[PDB]
PDB file of N, CA, C and O in Angstrom:
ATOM      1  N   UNK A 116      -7.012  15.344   2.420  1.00 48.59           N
ATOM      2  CA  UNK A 116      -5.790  15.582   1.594  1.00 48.59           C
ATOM      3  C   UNK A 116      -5.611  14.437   0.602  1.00 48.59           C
ATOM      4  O   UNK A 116      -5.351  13.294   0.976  1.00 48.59           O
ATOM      5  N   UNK A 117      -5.797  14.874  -1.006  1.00 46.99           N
ATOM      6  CA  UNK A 117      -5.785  13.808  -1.722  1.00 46.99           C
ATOM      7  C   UNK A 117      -4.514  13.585  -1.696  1.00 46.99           C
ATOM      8  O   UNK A 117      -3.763  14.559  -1.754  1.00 46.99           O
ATOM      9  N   UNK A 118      -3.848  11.961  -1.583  1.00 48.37           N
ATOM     10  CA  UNK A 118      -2.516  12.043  -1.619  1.00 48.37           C
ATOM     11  C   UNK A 118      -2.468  10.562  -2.738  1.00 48.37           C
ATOM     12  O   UNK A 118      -1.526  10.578  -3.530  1.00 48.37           O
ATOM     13  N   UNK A 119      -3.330   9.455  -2.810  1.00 48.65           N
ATOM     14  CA  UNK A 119      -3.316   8.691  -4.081  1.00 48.65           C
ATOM     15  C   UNK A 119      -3.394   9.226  -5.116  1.00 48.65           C
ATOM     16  O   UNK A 119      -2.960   8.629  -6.101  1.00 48.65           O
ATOM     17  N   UNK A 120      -4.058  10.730  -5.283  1.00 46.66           N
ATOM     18  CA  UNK A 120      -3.752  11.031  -6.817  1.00 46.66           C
ATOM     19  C   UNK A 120      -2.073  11.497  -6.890  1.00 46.66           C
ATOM     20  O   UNK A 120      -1.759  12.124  -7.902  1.00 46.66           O
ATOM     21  N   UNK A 121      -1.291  11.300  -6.157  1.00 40.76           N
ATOM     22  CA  UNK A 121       0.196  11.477  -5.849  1.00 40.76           C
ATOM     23  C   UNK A 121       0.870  10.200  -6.612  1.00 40.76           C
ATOM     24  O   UNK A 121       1.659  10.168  -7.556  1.00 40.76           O
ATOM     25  N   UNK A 122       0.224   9.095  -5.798  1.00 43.44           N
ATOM     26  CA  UNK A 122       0.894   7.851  -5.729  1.00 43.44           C
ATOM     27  C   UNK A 122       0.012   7.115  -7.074  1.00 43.44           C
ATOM     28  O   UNK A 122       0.488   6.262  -7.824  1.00 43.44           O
ATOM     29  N   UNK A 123      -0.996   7.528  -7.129  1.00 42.89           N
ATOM     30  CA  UNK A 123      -1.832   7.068  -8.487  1.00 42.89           C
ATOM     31  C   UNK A 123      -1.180   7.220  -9.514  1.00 42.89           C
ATOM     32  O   UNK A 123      -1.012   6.160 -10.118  1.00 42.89           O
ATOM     33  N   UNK A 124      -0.502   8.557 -10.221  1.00 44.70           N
ATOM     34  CA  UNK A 124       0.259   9.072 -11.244  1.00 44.70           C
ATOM     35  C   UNK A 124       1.254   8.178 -11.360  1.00 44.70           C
ATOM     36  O   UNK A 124       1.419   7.516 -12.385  1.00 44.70           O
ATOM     37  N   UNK A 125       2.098   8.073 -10.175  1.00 45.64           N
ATOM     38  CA  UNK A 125       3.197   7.352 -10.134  1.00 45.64           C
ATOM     39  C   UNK A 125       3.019   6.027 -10.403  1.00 45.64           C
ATOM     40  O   UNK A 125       3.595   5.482 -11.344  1.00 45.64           O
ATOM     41  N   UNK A 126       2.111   5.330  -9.503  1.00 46.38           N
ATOM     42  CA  UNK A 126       1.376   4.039  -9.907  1.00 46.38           C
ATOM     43  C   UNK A 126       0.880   3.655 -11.146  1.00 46.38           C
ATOM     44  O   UNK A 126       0.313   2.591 -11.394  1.00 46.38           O
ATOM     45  N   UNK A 127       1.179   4.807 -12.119  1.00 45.77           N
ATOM     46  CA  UNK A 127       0.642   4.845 -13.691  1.00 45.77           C
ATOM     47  C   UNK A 127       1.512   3.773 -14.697  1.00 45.77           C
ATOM     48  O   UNK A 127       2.710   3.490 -14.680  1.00 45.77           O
ATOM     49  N   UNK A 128       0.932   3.523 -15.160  1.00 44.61           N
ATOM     50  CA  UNK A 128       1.705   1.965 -16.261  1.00 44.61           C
ATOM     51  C   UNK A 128       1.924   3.327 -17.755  1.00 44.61           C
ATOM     52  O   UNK A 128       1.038   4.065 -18.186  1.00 44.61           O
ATOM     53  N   UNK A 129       3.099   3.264 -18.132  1.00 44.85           N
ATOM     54  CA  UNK A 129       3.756   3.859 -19.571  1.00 44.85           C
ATOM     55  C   UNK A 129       2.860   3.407 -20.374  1.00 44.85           C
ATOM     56  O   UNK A 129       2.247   2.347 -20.247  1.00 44.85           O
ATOM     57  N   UNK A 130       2.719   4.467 -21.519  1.00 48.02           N
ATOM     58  CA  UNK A 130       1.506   4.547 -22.215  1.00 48.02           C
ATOM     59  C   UNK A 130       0.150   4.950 -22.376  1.00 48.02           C
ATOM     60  O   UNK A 130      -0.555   5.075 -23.377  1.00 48.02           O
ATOM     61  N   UNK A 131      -0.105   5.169 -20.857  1.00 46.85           N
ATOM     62  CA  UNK A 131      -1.316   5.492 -20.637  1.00 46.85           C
ATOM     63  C   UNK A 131      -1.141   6.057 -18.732  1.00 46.85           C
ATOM     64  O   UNK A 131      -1.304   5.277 -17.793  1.00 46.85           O
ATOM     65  N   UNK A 132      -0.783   7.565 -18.578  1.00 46.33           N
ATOM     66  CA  UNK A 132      -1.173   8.219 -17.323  1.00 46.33           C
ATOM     67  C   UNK A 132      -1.903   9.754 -17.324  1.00 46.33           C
ATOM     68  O   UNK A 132      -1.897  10.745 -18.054  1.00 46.33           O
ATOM     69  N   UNK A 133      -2.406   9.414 -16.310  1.00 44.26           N
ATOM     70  CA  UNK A 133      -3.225  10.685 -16.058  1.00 44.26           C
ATOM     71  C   UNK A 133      -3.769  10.135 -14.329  1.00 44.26           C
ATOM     72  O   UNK A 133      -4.234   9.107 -13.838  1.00 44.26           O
ATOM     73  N   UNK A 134      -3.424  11.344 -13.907  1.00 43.47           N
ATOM     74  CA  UNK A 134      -3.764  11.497 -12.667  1.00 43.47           C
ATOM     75  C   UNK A 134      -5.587  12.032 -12.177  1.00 43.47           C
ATOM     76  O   UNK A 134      -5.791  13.240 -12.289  1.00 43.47           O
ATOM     77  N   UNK A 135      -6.583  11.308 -11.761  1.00 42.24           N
ATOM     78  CA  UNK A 135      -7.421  11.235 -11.453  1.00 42.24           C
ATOM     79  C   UNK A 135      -8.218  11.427 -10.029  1.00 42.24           C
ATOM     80  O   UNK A 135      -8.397  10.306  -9.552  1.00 42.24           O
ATOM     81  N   UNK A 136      -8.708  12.355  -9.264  1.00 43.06           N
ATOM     82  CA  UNK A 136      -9.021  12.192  -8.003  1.00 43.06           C
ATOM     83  C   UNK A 136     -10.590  12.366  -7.920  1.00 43.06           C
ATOM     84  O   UNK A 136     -11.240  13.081  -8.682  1.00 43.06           O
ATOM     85  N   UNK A 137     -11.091  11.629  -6.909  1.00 41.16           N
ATOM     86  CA  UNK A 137     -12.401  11.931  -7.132  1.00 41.16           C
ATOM     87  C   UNK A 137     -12.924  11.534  -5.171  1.00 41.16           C
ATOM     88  O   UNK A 137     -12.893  10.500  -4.503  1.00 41.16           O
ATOM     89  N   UNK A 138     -13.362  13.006  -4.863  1.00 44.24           N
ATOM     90  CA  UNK A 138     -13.820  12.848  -2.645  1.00 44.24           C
ATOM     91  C   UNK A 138     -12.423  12.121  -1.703  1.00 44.24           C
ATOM     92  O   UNK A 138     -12.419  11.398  -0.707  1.00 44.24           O
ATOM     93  N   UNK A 139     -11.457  12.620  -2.430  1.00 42.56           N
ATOM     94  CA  UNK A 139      -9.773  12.349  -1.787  1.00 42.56           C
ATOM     95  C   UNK A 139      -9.236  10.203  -2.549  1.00 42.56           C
ATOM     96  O   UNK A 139      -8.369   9.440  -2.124  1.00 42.56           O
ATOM     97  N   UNK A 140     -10.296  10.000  -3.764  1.00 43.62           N
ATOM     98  CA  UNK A 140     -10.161   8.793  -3.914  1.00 43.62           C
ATOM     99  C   UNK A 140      -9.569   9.287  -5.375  1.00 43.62           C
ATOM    100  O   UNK A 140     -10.018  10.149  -6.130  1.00 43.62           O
ATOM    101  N   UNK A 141      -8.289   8.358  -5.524  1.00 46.47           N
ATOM    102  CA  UNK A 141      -7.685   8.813  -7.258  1.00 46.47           C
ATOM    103  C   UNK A 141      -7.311   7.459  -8.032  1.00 46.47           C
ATOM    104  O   UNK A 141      -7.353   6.329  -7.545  1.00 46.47           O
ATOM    105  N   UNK A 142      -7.019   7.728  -9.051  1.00 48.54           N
ATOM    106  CA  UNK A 142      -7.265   7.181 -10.216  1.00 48.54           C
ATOM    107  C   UNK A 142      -6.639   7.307 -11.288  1.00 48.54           C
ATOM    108  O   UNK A 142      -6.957   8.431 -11.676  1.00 48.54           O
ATOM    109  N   UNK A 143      -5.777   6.761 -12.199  1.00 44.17           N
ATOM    110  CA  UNK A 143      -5.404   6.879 -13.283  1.00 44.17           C
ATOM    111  C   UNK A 143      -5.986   6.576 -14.568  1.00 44.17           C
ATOM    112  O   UNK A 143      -5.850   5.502 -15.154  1.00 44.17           O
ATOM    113  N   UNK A 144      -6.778   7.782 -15.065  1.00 44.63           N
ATOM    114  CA  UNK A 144      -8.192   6.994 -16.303  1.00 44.63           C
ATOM    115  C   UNK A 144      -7.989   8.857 -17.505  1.00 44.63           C
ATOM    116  O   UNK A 144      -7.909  10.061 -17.259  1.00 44.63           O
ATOM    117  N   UNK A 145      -7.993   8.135 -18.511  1.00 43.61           N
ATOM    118  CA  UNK A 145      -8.279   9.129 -19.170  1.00 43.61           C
ATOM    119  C   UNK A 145      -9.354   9.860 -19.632  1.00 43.61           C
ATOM    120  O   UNK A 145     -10.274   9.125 -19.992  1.00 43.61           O
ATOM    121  N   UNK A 146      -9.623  11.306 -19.780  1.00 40.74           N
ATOM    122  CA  UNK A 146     -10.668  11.885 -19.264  1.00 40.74           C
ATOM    123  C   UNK A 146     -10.912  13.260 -18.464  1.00 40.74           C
ATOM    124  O   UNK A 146     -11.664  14.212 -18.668  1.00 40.74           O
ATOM    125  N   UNK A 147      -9.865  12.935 -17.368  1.00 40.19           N
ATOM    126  CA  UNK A 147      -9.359  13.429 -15.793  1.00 40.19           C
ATOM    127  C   UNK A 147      -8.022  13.521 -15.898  1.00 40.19           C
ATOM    128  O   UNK A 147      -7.237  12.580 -16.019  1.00 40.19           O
ATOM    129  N   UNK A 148      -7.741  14.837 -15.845  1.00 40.89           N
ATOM    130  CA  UNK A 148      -5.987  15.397 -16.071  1.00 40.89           C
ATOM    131  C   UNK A 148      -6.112  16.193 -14.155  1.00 40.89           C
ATOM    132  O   UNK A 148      -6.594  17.325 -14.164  1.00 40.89           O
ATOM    133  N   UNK A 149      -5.796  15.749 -12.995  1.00 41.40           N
ATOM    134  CA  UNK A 149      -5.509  16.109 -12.060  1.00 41.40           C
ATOM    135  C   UNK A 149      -4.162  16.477 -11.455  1.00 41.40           C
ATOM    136  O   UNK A 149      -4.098  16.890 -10.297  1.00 41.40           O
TER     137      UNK A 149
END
């Protein structure tokens, strides 16, 4: 159950979010709209 791409988004700095998951591991990177 991916749940950092939850807390990743949120964990996102203004200016730059996008929610990223990759084998239940996430990420905020642009590129990857999750």
């Amino acid at each position: 159950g991916s749940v950092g791409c939850a807390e990743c988004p949120m964990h996102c700095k203004g200016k730059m979010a996008k929610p990223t998951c990759e084998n239940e591991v996430c990420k905020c990177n642009i590129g990857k709209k999750d």
